[PDB]
Amino acid sequence: LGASCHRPDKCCLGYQKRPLPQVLLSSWYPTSQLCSKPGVIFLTKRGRQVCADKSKDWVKKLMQQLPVTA
Amino acid sequence: SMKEPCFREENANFNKIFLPTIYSIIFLTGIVGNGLVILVMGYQSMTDKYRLHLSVADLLFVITLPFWAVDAVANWYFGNFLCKAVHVIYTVNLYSSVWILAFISLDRYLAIVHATNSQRPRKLLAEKVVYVGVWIPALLLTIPDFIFANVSEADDRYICCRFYPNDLWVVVFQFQHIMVGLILPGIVILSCYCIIISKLSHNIFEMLRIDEGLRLKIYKDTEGYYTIGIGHLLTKSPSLNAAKSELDKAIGRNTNGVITKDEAEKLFNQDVDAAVRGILRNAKLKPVYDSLDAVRRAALINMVFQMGETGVAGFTNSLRMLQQKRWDEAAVNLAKSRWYNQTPNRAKRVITTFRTGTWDAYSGSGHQKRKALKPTVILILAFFACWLPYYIGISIDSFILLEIIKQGCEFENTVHKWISITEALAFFHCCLNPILYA
């Protein structure tokens, strides 16, 4: 209702330039349709979350190797 | 060195501390307050009819507030039916309240500008036109709240919002709300106020036209200074051309000492501003000026034009009774003054105006035509005072979406925290009506 409808989900304002190692990453999930910029959020084994562009070649490879977050 | 997403968790803890207190106070004040109004008004004045329409429209939204409090801090559990029900009541309250105030502005316009015979248009408006012009379009604007308002899952929790098929629907209802609920009622209230004060200032001009007298030529004062209109002094200078040039500068037009009734009124209004600004600066005249009506002020301004700021200030004995509202006791105590025997015809017209509070002491028409303006102007200004910090938040947030202001995650969440708290505080307009009785 009103304010809660404005910005309720995590969005990507920028993407990771340097490719990430598969050994440190645990899962992946895409950004909400509500977000201005599309992309995926890589969940590391460490716990921290990293943005990435879905159009990138190294990102498309990591999505194949990793599962979707539960 | 890693890129992180924009976490909205910093907005979640903000709402969980500040908003539960705000939604609790406004709920209790809006249910005890407006609850008593409907029981006292409806069961057992003209503007009181519109306040009955207002106290029922906001009360319907007060019983809707417990749902607003839970959605802002926790999650939406209530379901899809309550989701549409809350959205419809919110749409009704947004356009009904803002157009009831617009109809209040129209009621004051008819009661002040066309008071001669306005009992019929004022009745027709409050008894019939109010339903056709306020409640019928308000219930007709709830159609999208029956189509697009529904519950949806978003990341962490469920959200009850209006979901449109594409961005073209989002931007047309975005611009529709600004017109019907902010610009169009704003024009109606502004255009009423601007022609009510225009009438009020004209009534003083015709009042002093009778007393002092209108002169469309440059004439010499009792003291010998060059004057024009209703006692408007041009210069203390003994030169005619100096005053003639001073007149051309004040008007803008190259006049040869000749001015029109309209030009004479423009100069008059300028002299009233100077007299009012000086009166509210005087320690013995300022606590009296605010206590008086609209016609009783005109009679006090008349005394200032006749004697002066220093002269009127010498009525310390009479000004004390003038605040105590003992109008019959003050007039008999002011009739004994040397001012009354200095000029008897002008003084009797001014003292009977202070005694009764009627402009009919000069006008050859009706009697006891007194109307209140002070409770209205407060209610409308205090209404926009609640919404002003909320519409500031949307304006800044709009530039972020229009790609004019492009900053980080922190600034993006700062405007949200501003909107989230100013939305909760903007609902105080529900409590505004019963609190105005104090």
Longest dimension (CA), chain B: 93
CA angle at residue B183 from B177 to B189, to 5 degrees?
A: 130
φ, ψ (nearest 5 deg) of residue B332: -75, -30
Through-space distance between the first and last CA atoms of chain B, rounded to whole angstroms: 61
Contacts of B95 (CB under 8 A, 6+ apart): B134, B137, B138, B141, B180, B181
Token pair of B211, please?
A: 């007393």
Asked whether residue B205 is marked as a ligand-binding residue, the answer is no
Which residues of B belong to the active site?
212, 221
Nearest Cα neighbor of B231 from B273, B279, B264, B274 is: B264
Give the closest of B6, B157, B159 to A10, CB-based: B6
- CA distance linking residue B99 with residue B181, whole number of Å: 8
Q: What are phi and psi of B220, to 5 degrees?
A: -95, 135
The alpha helices in B162-308, defined as continuous H runs, are 167-178, 184-211, 240-251, 261-279, 286-289, 295-306
Residue with tokens 């600066």: B281
Report d(CA B352, CA B356) in Å as an integer: 6
User: Considering only CB atoms, which chain A residues are within 8 Å of B5?
Assistant: 10-13, 31, 41, 49, 51
Count of helix runs (H) and strand runs (E) in chain B: 22, 5
From chain B, the residues in CB contact with A52 under 8 A are 3
Q: Are the beta carbons of A11 and B86 separated by less than 8 Å?
A: no
Residue A70 DSSP class:
-
**How many Å apart are CA B31 and CA B34, to the nearest integer?**
6
Which positions in chain B touch A6 (Cβ < 8 Å)?
397, 416, 419-420
Three-class SS state of B31: helix
Contact flag A8-B159 (C-beta cutoff 8 Å): yes
Helix or strand run (H / E) with residue B429: none
CA atoms within 13 A on the CB side of A58: 10
For B356, residues 6+ apart whose C-beta sits below 8 A from its C-beta are B327, B368
Radius of gyration of the CA atoms of chain B, in A:
28
C-alpha span between B307 and B119 (Å, rounded) = 39
**What sign results for the dihedral spanned by CA atoms B15, B21, B22, B23?**
positive
**Facing residue for B159 by CB, picked from A4, A15, A31:** A4
What are the beta bridge partners of residue A44?
A25
Three-class DSSP labels, B180-221: HHHHHHHHHHHHHHHHHHHHHHHHHHHHHHHHCCCCCCCEEC
Q: Which two tokens stand for residue B182?
A: 């902010």
Question: Which two structure tokens, joined as six digits, stand for B229?
Answer: 């209109």
Mutation choice for A interface testing from B6, B87, B89, B403 by most A CBs within 10 A: B6
Question: What token pair was written down for A7?
Answer: 């910005």
Residues of chain A positioned with their CB less than 8 A from the CB of B68: 1
| Range B241-258 burial, b when 16+ CB lie within 10 A, else e | eebbebbeebbeeebeee
Q: Phi and psi at residue B154, in whole multiples of 5°?
A: -140, 100
Task: Give kind and range of the element (H or E) at residue A51.
Answer: strand A49-52
The interaxial angle of helices B327-334 and B316-323, nearest 10 deg, is: 160
Going along chain A from its start, the domains and CATH numbers come out as: 1-70 (2.40.50.40)
Task: Give the whole-angstrom CA distance, residue B218 versus residue A67.
Answer: 94
Contact B419, A6 (CB under 8 A): yes
Using CA atoms, how far residue B202 sits from B185, B226, B236, B266, in Å, is: 26, 24, 28, 10
Which residue among B2, B90, B416 places its CB closest to the CB of A50? B2
Helix B295-306 and helix B261-279: axis angle, to 10°?
90
Query: Which are the contacts of B241, defined by CB distance < 8 A and separation ≥ 6?
Result: none
Would you say the C-alpha torsion B5, B9, B10, B11 has a positive or negative sign?
positive
Quote the longest CA-to-CA distance of chain A: 42
* Partners of A51 in the β-ladder: A41
Question: What SS3 string covers B343-398?
Answer: CHHHHHHHHHHHHHCCHHHCCCCCCCCCCCCHHHHHHHHHHHHHHHHHHHHHHHHH
Across-strand partners of B157?
B154
